[model samples]
Target chain A: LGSMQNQRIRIRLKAFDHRLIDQATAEIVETAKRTGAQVRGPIPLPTRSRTHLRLVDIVEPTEKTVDDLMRLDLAAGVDVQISLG
Target chain B: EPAARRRARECAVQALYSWQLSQNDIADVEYQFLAEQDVKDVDVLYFRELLAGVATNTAYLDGLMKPYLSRLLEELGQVEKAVLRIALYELSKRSDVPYKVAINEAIELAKSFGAEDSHKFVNGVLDKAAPVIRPNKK
Candidate 1:
């Protein structure tokens, strides 16, 4: 078995604005990958309220590295709404 | 590592688990172990170092192993996490300890104290962890 045998990076994102939910999630996935963080999803989550947005993504870095794992930066004021739903 | 020191690591793992669970003052937890004082052959100094280092640098150590976990840290069996923490401490910080020794000792401790499958879990983590911690693994 190689490295990354049983480890995972879990991300939880809550956007203040419901409209921006998709964008923030995508931004996070993009930034995560740009920095070499192997992303699993901008996985859409059921928001607590129709208006109040909430998203949780699992950011898993691939077989690329040790130090580069889990470098998650959810940019300020950015709520991703790349909804695959 | 000698038998006595190996036992010391075992103690350290227990102490670290206590610290993690209780979130008590580490000094208090360390004292709890020393107060009982049943250990005769234990390398108390190494125990102290392992306990202190593992306790204090837990976030740092977990950060090291976090990337490799298929599950969340909270999802890890408590015993396996403790085992990995001590072994990771030995492998990464203490050059005096050979990486293989660190890996082997953690496995032994896991089997002796942890659940039936914990050794495999611990072994899987520390084995992969060793190479990452010690890239110069000879």
Candidate 2:
């Protein structure tokens, strides 16, 4: 796998409720499908007060896909970080 | 997908959440759930695995996490605490998942349910902690 392909996409957004997590998970799966990436759960965890959402997937997003997702504005004040596998 | 595993995950989350809030007695909290009817045997088993695994390995997990944690573990919110418990359980016990998998899963959970800054905060802590938690892996 190239550096990008070998990379696992990890994104962490501001915490929301179960409903938001479910919505984001669905969006992520669809986005991954369109981008030829494999997506996993928006796993649940307790936060100070709200709920937290985390997602892991194997993806090599083209510039276009990345831009497309950036346009969605899924969560306000959302902070995203990526790492290579 | 085993329903028991799902139940176990849920139960663990609940227990951890309770711990986060009150720092109450885990035995009492666990007993209350165990007494419930809807929780099946399989769920109980999984829950037992998670709870015991976390309790047994807490020292190691805490040591690994201490460096990255912004505050004491007790100060972390309920959702973050529960996420950590689940992630720590997987990190210590579930070799099937890579260390990154456990960390990323926790981050996902934080993003969905945690407070405003939880995702980044969780990512930071787990990123620093994962290597220490599973150092034996190359």
Candidate 3:
């Protein structure tokens, strides 16, 4: 069977209080939808000592759209990476 | 380690370690860990699943593991003990992961964080443990 094309979006956000994680995730989801990207999840928040939030999403975005989305000011000091699989 | 898997493994390790130390009820151990500061909901979920699953079917899990073990459980090194506990939990409970994946991941974890010789020890133990835990399910 052929594998379905998928894209992974990983974001590391600044540590705010735990309450902020949900708000930040919702904002990211809203941004993705507004930009017309097909995505699923801001899934499982990682609980390591160093970082407060690690959000992952699988999205299918055209090259141009992916560029546009990355340029958005999602968060101060945010690190984002996108990979195709 | 993939973030999810890392979180799962660490959570499982902590949960099991807590149980080992407390000699209290597993539920109490689970509750205590969940209530700790800076605990994420995701980590809690992972720990809960591992702890509950392993506790429920220890005999089956240990049966899968006994063949691979170099010595009896009590004689295992700390790293080996930790790796086996997590690997056994994965083998017996998380059907989504293949036995090979669980064993390999355990070996990798051992190499990175375990004592010297732990990687080989963990690899040997898990290789023997996998078949009995989840036989013929490639």
Candidate 4:
């Protein structure tokens, strides 16, 4: 069971305005794919509030690829939350 | 304090609490913390690891802990549930973290966010869980 496991970076982007949310979400997805990572979503997680909207994406990336996504220059106002698993 | 990691744990606790209630994807809960909550001073990397680890292995961690629990997992307070899973994640998966450190951190988390008496419940469960998970650590 101790063979090998893929590392995943779970990305969640949120914004009061989804314009930048879509922009940055796509940017992240592009970056992950460019770095040879398997990208999943900008899955819509409807906002808890009336205004805010959230998008979630999960990626299985190589360690070096993780570094590349970490360095992504996402736009301002988008809340970029990236976690490793 | 390694102040940064402490802050990370603090942020992770809140994030996990959010995840428990909303049942949103882990990423959404994490984004909620960064967007609406204060996490600028936290160790963002470790915070991610803790949250993601707990999110990904929740069932496994819960199973390890179920034998020690006094009540059903769903019957526990959300804060208690979050703390137990986080601490168990550290104990079972992150061998680099000592058992004492895992237990103490969890106890502290319970005190800060859990019910007044939740710390005792947290401590009691970890006291049992730590030995079983890290039998050779001592």
Candidate 5:
């Protein structure tokens, strides 16, 4: 987990309090340094308040294809929604 | 039970993690593994099914996991994430396996491939997610 190479660990931490973010960032940077890893920011985005959106995958077009559409539609039946009533 | 499929799962998870960390083309990743590794002995067909199955149904699997997971999908370690992808893939697609067996196997993979705490994290996520993903939980 060391080396300042392309092996950068990008962690975005969020809390309602600035104090909280600073405390966490301080711990993280120190830990990263101690572990011999690279360092960057607890860079606050433009927004004053921070919220960590825990996302595994953000559905990008690159990860897309027609097969995805067909399969997703397979489970979401079109007939179920359009009742004559 | 034969251990061949287990080896297949192990390779399949590693192949997927290769895709994840690199964000390289999926087929590219698959070919690299198949062409390079000790693939001759393992259940090759089983590995292919998991690769195709998880590739196609990632969102569906993540949808099931999101509600119970402590961390986001991308936030999780690549090794454990790959193992869970395999775990959820086999559980949802292959009725041949019991969910208990699926979860246990995934924990084993996480321990072998991921960090020391990875097994616990993998165990925590899959334990809660599997119940909902495969409600029967055999």
Candidate 6:
């Protein structure tokens, strides 16, 4: 994708295990940080199960940042959703 | 479809309970649920409508349920509170859902997520509230 000006990436994650979701959120946040992108959250959402939950985080990406963040091996059970706006 | 709607209600109750603790914007809450969770298997639109409706009219919904409650709304368990709000929201607004359906689902949610005896209390309150909220319904 060409560099469309003013694009924002929203990433969301869910898992039955809060631990995996937390681990995924932290890894993505750190990955974006390393790429020098502006990051917003691992914003917590309601728990899906009594023992489970979800997280959403936003980032401003550079060309290399998206590839960098996507390449990391996140743990199993962490469901990821990404959208652009 | 009913099963999907049931799942939506379950999700809304949990979401509402979480919102009660954080007191965050409903938009953020909605965004989080849709983006971060597996609502693909549920009635996503119904879930959004129900959660947004209850969040926006919480005070009004509480008022509708207040007259039937043995205890104050604040004194109720958070799960019970969320269940009542969802029930009343349907009773008052979503005419497509029969009042009995509304109340029955609330009972199920209360039983599943609420305190052990909360389902009984929820049943009694909705039994009283249904006629008042939807007098035309059986």
Off by over 4 Å in 3: A1-85, B41-43, B70-74, B135-137
- For all the models shown, what interface RMSD does each have? 18.2, 10.2, 14.0, 12.8, 14.8, 8.0
For model 4 the local lDDT of residue B38 reads: 57
Cα lDDT, all candidates: 0.63, 0.59, 0.57, 0.71, 0.58, 0.73
- Looking at model 1, how many pairs of residues clash? 17
lDDT for residue B70 in candidate 2, whole number 0-100:
53
* Predicted candidate 3 versus true structure: per-residue lDDT over B1-138, tens digit per residue: 356666666566545543443334678667655664345535556667777776666677667666666455545643356567778888777877677777887886666445445678787777666776677845
* Comparison by TM-score, 2 against 5, better one: 5
* Candidate 4 ranges with C-alpha deviation above 4 Å: A1-85, B70-74
Tell the DockQ for candidate 2: 0.10
DockQ values, each candidate: 0.01, 0.10, 0.01, 0.02, 0.02, 0.05
Task: Write model 1 residue lDDT over B16-95, tens digit each, in one string.
Answer: 65555445577876776786546788988888888888888989999889878966454664456878988889887898
Across A1-85, the per-residue lDDT of candidate 3 in tens digits comes to 1143545454544443333443455556555556655434333333444344434453555555455556666555444455445
Top-DockQ structure, candidate number: 2
Query: Which pairs clash inside model 6?
Result: none
User: Whose lDDT is greatest here?
Assistant: 6
Clashing pairs in 4: none
Single out the weakest 10-residue window by summed lDDT for candidate 1 chain A: A41-50
What residue runs in model 1 are displaced by over 4 Å at the alpha carbon? A1-85, B72-74
Candidate 5 local lDDT, B1-138, one digit each (tens) = 458888888788766754544444566656666775667778888887887788778799778777767445545654566788899887777899888889888987876666545678788888888887777788
lDDT of 4 by residue, A31-82 (tens): 7667766554344442444333444444556665767776778777777766
TM-score of each: 0.59, 0.50, 0.52, 0.60, 0.58, 0.61
Q: Model 5: clashing residue pairs?
A: A56-B73, A56-B74
